[PDB]
Amino acid sequence: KGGVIMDVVNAEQAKIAEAAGAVAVMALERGVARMADPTVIEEVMNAVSIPVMAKVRIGHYVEARVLEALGVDYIDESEVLTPADEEFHIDKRQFTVPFVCGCRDLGEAARRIAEGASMLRTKGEPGTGNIVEAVRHMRKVNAQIRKVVNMSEDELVAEAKQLGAPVEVLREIKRLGRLPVVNFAAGGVTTPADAALMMHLGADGVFVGSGIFKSENPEKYARAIVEATTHYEDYELIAHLSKG
Template identity: 50%
Template structure:
């Protein structure tokens, strides 16, 4: 994926004109992250480890609090500023879904990307942020093709297909969501023009973006996977399923040598078609994965839910 040419959203003469069409500039900025791993961090030290291990960006979040309750919000702005000064890679910060004021604040302090994230909380149940009102590129989550294309219509420059958020290392939810999106795209590619109208209605997708997706054979913007990605094999699986990169959660720091784990996953993204490199990257990680086992009870519950 990293070697492909840059994708664009609109097939018009304005796409290269960043004054008349600033959205194309934001899509181009998101292209810079293709073929990389974005690591979630909650401290300055973690950000430095992620950068040294080869992360393409860091996603700043508040430190996990045991038995915490209440609403999660955008991260501590002091921490965001400290990390932005300390690292040379892009810095991503989350705002709540629909909370355009949090997004305005994050843009004001100079974050490189804003993740309008359902993972932390939803501030407006009926509306997402109008991302065209911002200069900063937005990342948005999805679990279906219709959700992805609607977020792009609102101005998202990158799509994050989301799986589980519990930090257990269970990649099954992520695989399910990725296969849903990619499966719909493959179905779309084999349709004639008359069928595309019905498909757009069925998936609640903007018709022009459905046509763009059909023409390109992929989402019109950069597409990352998130949730349960904790090994080089997990990352390579996401890439081989058609993603452009991955998000790595904070659980990768719950080990003796987080640098080794992150570096292995980064190599898994970059060399996702080479099983020999993947095998080398996966060696000596058994001890680092000891805290990310899914117990039998959770496996049985997962199977009953999907039955």
């Protein structure tokens, strides 16, 4: 909960991220984008004590099994890599290691969960610095959850048909009053204000990319995001944090 997860390409960036207060890090390096070289992942795992994630192409069962074997803590089945299967996602239920997946709406979310996803993430539009798509997705998902939590029980099967969702997952959402997994914001989150907004909109946490490390003082900038995400209703603090 409450946390920020950061993208890193080496041990130095990993240590900054850990020092800045990240709850976890996402190992990458940077045509066709594949699973990272395991050297880099091991480099990062050795550099920190906080959980390390990495990531695979959509549908790439074997890339995922490789990362599981490397002892990675979380796998992100990620659309920002070149999809390897355009119709079917990994059957994540068959893995020990837990998975994070992207979603744009409650139908997708529910299908990812039925495939065995342990965690969800907004799809966003990564690299753009623009928060708009992440906001669209978080609003859509949460609006649809609210509708489902409060709807007449006998209308769920029909709702499930409409959304393209598994009814059992909707029934669980209704019963819990929320998603049975955590759902983070991801894509374009750039300023402290952005991060706190995502929390305001119902995110459980946020993902942030390599933008942090292109700034002049990455340590300070990473901390600003971390503190804004934790104290997302402290507007005096966030105002202060946004001066760098």
